[PDB]
Amino acid sequence: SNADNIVTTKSGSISESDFNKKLKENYGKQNLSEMVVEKVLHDKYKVTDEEVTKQLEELKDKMGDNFNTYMESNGVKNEDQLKEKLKLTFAFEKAIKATVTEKDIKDHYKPKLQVSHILVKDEKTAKEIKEKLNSGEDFAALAKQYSEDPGSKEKGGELSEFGPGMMVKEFEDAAYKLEVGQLSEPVKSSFGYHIIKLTDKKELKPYEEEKENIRKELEQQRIQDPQFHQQVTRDLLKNADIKVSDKDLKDTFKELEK
Amino acid sequence: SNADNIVTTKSGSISESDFNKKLKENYGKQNLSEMVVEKVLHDKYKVTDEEVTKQLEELKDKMGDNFNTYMESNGVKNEDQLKEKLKLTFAFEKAIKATVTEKDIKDHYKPKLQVSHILVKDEKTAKEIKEKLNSGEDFAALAKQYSEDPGSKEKGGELSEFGPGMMVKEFEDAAYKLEVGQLSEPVKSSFGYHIIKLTDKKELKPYEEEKENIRKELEQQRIQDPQFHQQVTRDLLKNADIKVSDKDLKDTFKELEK
């Protein structure tokens, strides 16, 4: 019964009752949180047995003899339990992929830009250089004279072609406001102050032939960002209309406010 | 009853039965381990209410208004619960202090040594210097000529007086084998190769007037070393003659083997 010991020691025994009460007091909330999140992910994003058995076989071949040792190091004791971990992980990813909207994909359908840039440490030098450019001095020559970027000062300030999300927002936004041959205003970044010149604006395949690739890149970009793992968790729980009836676990979703 | 919900969501409800079963499966062992360790520490090393109430008041004054906010950030909701944390921490320290034996205190009752040293990068240069010393060349002069130690090459290789446990074992052991005026053999350390000369061997107060200080230093030295927190935990559990009767929690003290 509840008053019967579950362990004996030379320091005394512990009843199943005291054990169960202590357990709910120190893990009740963490366990309810996990349980509800797992119940919502399997509800909103179903994963099939094929997608999980497949991922498992690809892990068995890679692990080999080191598999039976790895499975026991994750609170898992059966292959059915490891599938549950793999399945929960795959549902979580489907949840993140679902946060990618048309607008997010359109904001990234922009042509790759071929630009040159001059990097100086202070804003004073940047305005001075921007004035020599207005006077008609050669951008490639000024980049050889003042740029601090070792990988572009010898090559007229040329940078490898780039596209959306590949550069710092301040640098990117300034570059897409330019027309071929136009110069930017001094742009501040962590390395100092930049002057951007657009030399070429690469062609762009139709939208309907790029949305697939754009979507996959955003999807993978969010899967690595743990900022989205916290965002997706938080949103699934708020949209779950959670109501705890157990008095001891009432303030489990306490910090879900935001 | 057990079939009654403890939470409702738009993704479905969870019964108290499923909740309790899932809880024991994902925290049963971690909770049993903690519970037994806490039961052994309060059994072998009693802490009084004065030692805990006192430590608490010293924490209230330091925390001030930031206290009511700190207490809620440690899974604690009452002052009686915070005392339990403080008490467990004080019992754990008493456990570590108890690992200090007479032999450990005697091995540290040694006189402080005043030595000079020459530091070179290779063993070849060390033997060459050790030979110039045998020939009768001045140690202070050779330290000015070859030592790599910026803080002692200009001062004849002099080092501040030191005692047991303050230096690397290889350096310390070599220094206590010397008599005033004797030179060591080349000693290897992380910085290279050393040649030690003992210039003075400071006086030492009687053993009975030093064991108190020696004991306190070893006690505090082990309280910071987490190598002892794992050692004391492991030993208290092995000396507890633990026997788990619950089948689901049988392999909780599985990895206690050593």
Closest residue on chain A to B23 (Cα): A31
CB contact under 8 A, B14 and A35: yes
- Tokens coding A134: 């207005």
User: Is there a contact between A26 and A39 (Cβ–Cβ < 8 Å)?
Assistant: no
**CA-based diameter of chain B, in Å?**
93
Which of chain A's residues have a Cβ under 8 Å away from the Cβ of B34?
26
Chain B contact for A7 (CB, 8 A cutoff): yes
Residue B211 neighbours by CB distance under 10 Å: 15
What is d(CA A214, CA A164) in angstroms, rounded to the nearest whole number?
A: 10
Q: How was this structure determined?
A: X-ray
Residues A129, A197: Cα–Cα separation, whole Å: 13
Structure tokens at A132: 């020599």
- In whole angstroms, what is the distance from residue B161 CA to residue B203 CA? 12
Question: Rounded to an integer, what distance in angstroms lies between the CA atom of residue B52 and that of residue B79?
Answer: 11
User: Residues A183, A196: contact at Cβ < 8 Å?
Assistant: yes
Closest residue in A to B8 (Cα–Cα):
A243
Walk across the sheet containing A243-244 and list its strands: A243-244, B5-8, B14-15
**What tokens were used for A225?**
């960002």
**At residue B15, what are phi and psi to the nearest 5 degrees?**
-75, 160
For A48-82, b/e burial (b = at least 16 CB within 10 A) is: eeeebeebeeeeeeeeeeebeeebeeeeeeeeeeb
Tell me whether residues B39 and A245 touch, CB distance under 8 A.
Answer: no
The minimal CB distance from A7 to the residues B24, B32, B44 is found for B32
DSSP-derived pairing of the beta strands A243-244 and B14-15 = unpaired
**CA nearest B245 in A: which residue?**
A6
CB burial of residue B3 (10 Å; 0-12, 13-18, 19+): exposed
Q: Mark which residues 14-53 of B lie under 8 Å from A by CB.
A: 14, 16, 19-20, 22-24, 26-28, 30-32, 34-36, 39-40, 43-44
Contacts of A81 (CB under 8 A, 6+ apart): none
What CATH number does domain A108-206 carry, 2.40.110.10, 3.10.50.40, 3.40.1390.30, 3.40.50.1860?
A: 3.10.50.40
Give φ, ψ of A4 to 5 degrees.
-85, 140
Where residue B181 falls (left for φ over 0; alpha for ψ -120 to 50; beta otherwise) is: left
Within 10 angstroms of residue B93's Cβ, the number of other Cβ atoms is 17
At position A107, the amino acid (one-letter code) is D
CA distance A129 to A123: 10
Question: Is the dihedral angle over the CA atoms B75, B80, B85, B88 positive or is it negative?
Answer: negative
Report CA-CA distances (Å) from A217 to A164, A205, B1: 11, 17, 50
Instruction: Determine whether the interchain pair B244/A7 forms a contact, defined as Cβ–Cβ distance below 8 Å.
Output: yes
Kindly list the strands in the beta sheet with A192-201, ordered across the sheet, starting from the edge strand earlier in the chain.
A113-120, A192-201, A187-189
For B75, name the nearest residue in chain A, comparing CA atoms only.
A26
Q: What is the DSSP letter of A240?
A: T
Residues A87, A52 contacting (CB under 8 angstroms): yes
Q: What's the first-to-final CA gap in chain A, in angstroms? A: 44
Q: Answer whether B242 sits within 8 Å of A28, measured CB to CB.
A: no
Residues of B in contact with A251 (CB under 8 A): none
* Token pair for A234: 């938080």
Q: How far is Cα B230 from Cα B226, in angstroms, rounded to an integer?
A: 6
Residues A4 and A15: beta-carbon distance below 8 Å = yes
Please state whether beta strands B192-201 and B187-189 pair in parallel, antiparallel, or not at all (unpaired): antiparallel
Considering only CB atoms, which chain A residues are within 8 Å of B22?
31, 35
Cβ contact (<8 Å) for A9 and B34?
Answer: no
Give the C-alpha separation, B215 to B238, whole Å: 26
Rg (CA), chain B: 29
Cβ distance A249 to B7 less than 8 Å, yes or no, reads yes
CA–CA dist B199, B113 (Å, integer): 8
Between helix B79-97 and helix B49-63 the angle, nearest 10°, is: 120
Q: Does an H or E element contain A77, and which? A: none
CA nearest to A148, candidates A122, A174, A181: A122
Residues 6+ apart with CB under 8 A from A235: none
Q: Bridge partners of B162?
A: B113
Distance in Å, alpha carbon of B14 to nearest chain A alpha carbon: 8
- Ramachandran region of residue A10, left (φ > 0), alpha (ψ -120 to 50) or beta? alpha
DSSP chain B: -TTSEEEE-TT--EEHHHHHHHHHHHHHHHHHHHHHHHHHHHHHS---HHHHHHHHHHHHHHHGGGHHHHGGGGT--SHHHHHHHHHHHHHHHHHHHTT--HHHHHTT----EEEEEEEESSHHHHHHHHHHHHTT--HHHHHHHH---TTTGGGTTB---B-TTSS-HHHHHHHHT--TT-B---EEETTEEEEEEEEEE-----HHHHHHHHHHHHHHHHHH-HHHHHHHHHHHHHTT--EE--GGGTTSSGGG--
Tell me which residues of chain B, numbers 169 to 208, contact chain A at a CB-CB cutoff of 8 Å. Answer: none
Measured between CB atoms, which of A9, A14, A244 is closest to B7?
A244
Planar angle of CA B85, B216, A10, nearest 5 degrees: 50
Distance in Å, alpha carbon of B19 to nearest chain A alpha carbon: 7
A242 chain-B contacts, CB cut-off 8 A: 7-9
Tokens 């892990």 correspond to what residue? A59
Integer-rounded Cα Rg, in Å, for chain A is: 29
Rounded to an integer, what distance in angstroms lies between the CA atom of residue B52 and that of residue B173? 42
Secondary structure (DSSP) of A127-189: HHHHHHHHTT--HHHHHHHH---TTTGGGTTB---B-TTSS-HHHHHHHHT--TT-B---EEE
Contacts of B5 (CB under 8 A, 6+ apart): A245, B13, B14, B15, B16
Distance CA(A231)–CA(A223), nearest Å, equals 12
- C-beta separation of A201 from A193 below 8 A: no
Instruction: List the alpha helices (DSSP H) in chain A.
Output: 16-44, 49-63, 67-70, 79-97, 102-106, 123-134, 139-146, 169-176, 207-224, 226-238
